[PDB]
Here is the input.
Amino acid sequence: XLXLXLXLXLXL
Here is the structure.
């Protein structure tokens, strides 16, 4: 939910 899946992976 922060970085991971909120930028990195999901988001990207």
